[PDB]
Design a protein around this ligand. Structure first.
Ligand SMILES: O[C@@H]1[C@@H](O)[C@H](O)OC[C@H]1O
Ligand SMILES: [Ca+2]
Length: 303
């Protein structure tokens, strides 16, 4: 049984080749780690490789767990061919991408429309930068036109799907939260957003910032009336003791917040994003680290 089997909110994980073994024995929600990124699907223009995204979607369906589509608009891992197209043609490509996903995947629980607006807009012309910001109206009069246009597209193509914005290094500072809240509010004005995502990777939750700051910022975001999801949670493990201590300090702050409707870990086995920082909860030999032992017991005691 997954850790959150009897909980009031889900505890999911990023899904990928390395995260596959034993997934459904631990987690009860998923996000495709890489397969739902536009550059993963349409690396070569107008040929769609759905295989990895199909796997994540079908696995979610078969194991009867919520599926978060990750991600429609982002500033990396975008198709290489799109960055040199005129905005007029880029926009048509974006429209087609939205339609393609909407058509193929009717049972999306949460659609991550835009990831990292404060950190990585699609404005770079490097390999996977996309460089399509102007195709979405650029900054415009509000400063966030491209985010608005992305969610307008989402409402059009996914008229009955919960729409989510996602970003990192938000709750770690009042200033970032205030910046992010502005984006959420602009989206709320057009009733375009249904959920607020914050990643909470290891770099966002170091002991340099008090837990009270994260908590106050969760409260600030909660005042929108929108549910909050922690989307890409991980904690480094240079030692077992540090990872354990950090899990005890950090995880309950988010798990116990009434506005938080679920947490997704960004991997749990070696080969996850923060592999060099040893953020995995299970070792190379398959044994469970102390942080995971605690997490199981903690979640069981906090339903
Ligand atoms: O695989 C990595 C993924 O885990 C992260 O979320 O985005 C960057 C990718 O390289
Ligand atoms: Ca296309």
């Amino acid at each position: 049984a997954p850790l959150a089997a009897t909980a009031s909110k889900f505890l999911g994980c990023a899904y990928g080749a390395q995260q596959a073994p034993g997934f459904a024995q631990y987690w009860n929600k998923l996000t495709p780690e890489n397969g739902g990124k536009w550059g993963s699907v349409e690396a070569v223009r107008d040929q769609m490789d759905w295989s990895t995204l199909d796997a994540a979607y079908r696995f979610a369906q078969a194991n009867q767990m919520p599926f978060q589509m990750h991600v429609m608009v982002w500033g990396n891992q975008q198709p290489e061919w799109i960055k040199t197209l005129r905005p007029a043609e880029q926009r048509r490509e974006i429209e087609q991408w939205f339609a393609a996903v909407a058509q193929r995947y009717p049972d999306i629980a949460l659609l991550e429309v835009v990831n990292e607006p404060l950190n990585d807009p699609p404005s770079k012309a490097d390999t996977g930068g996309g460089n399509y910001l102007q195709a979405l109206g650029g900054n415009g009069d509000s400063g966030w036109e491209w985010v608005l246009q992305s969610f307008r597209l989402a409402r059009r193509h996914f008229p009955h799907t919960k729409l989510m914005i996602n970003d990192y290094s938000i709750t770690s500072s009042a200033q970032a939260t205030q910046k992010y809240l502005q984006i959420v509010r602009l989206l709320q004005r057009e009733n375009l957003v249904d959920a607020i995502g914050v990643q909470e990777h290891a770099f966002e939750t170091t002991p340099e910032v008090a837990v009270s700051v994260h908590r106050d910022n969760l409260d600030a975001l909660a005042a929108t009336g929108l549910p909050i999801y922690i989307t890409e949670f991980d904690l480094d493990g240079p030692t077992d003791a540090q990872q354990l201590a950090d899990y005890k300090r950090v995880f309950p702050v988010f798990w116990e917040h009434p506005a938080v409707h679920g947490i997704t870990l960004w991997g749990f086995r070696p080969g996850l994003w923060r592999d060099k920082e040893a953020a995995y909860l299970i070792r190379a030999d398959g044994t469970e680290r102390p942080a995971l032992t605690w997490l199981r017991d903690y979640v069981a005691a906090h339903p």
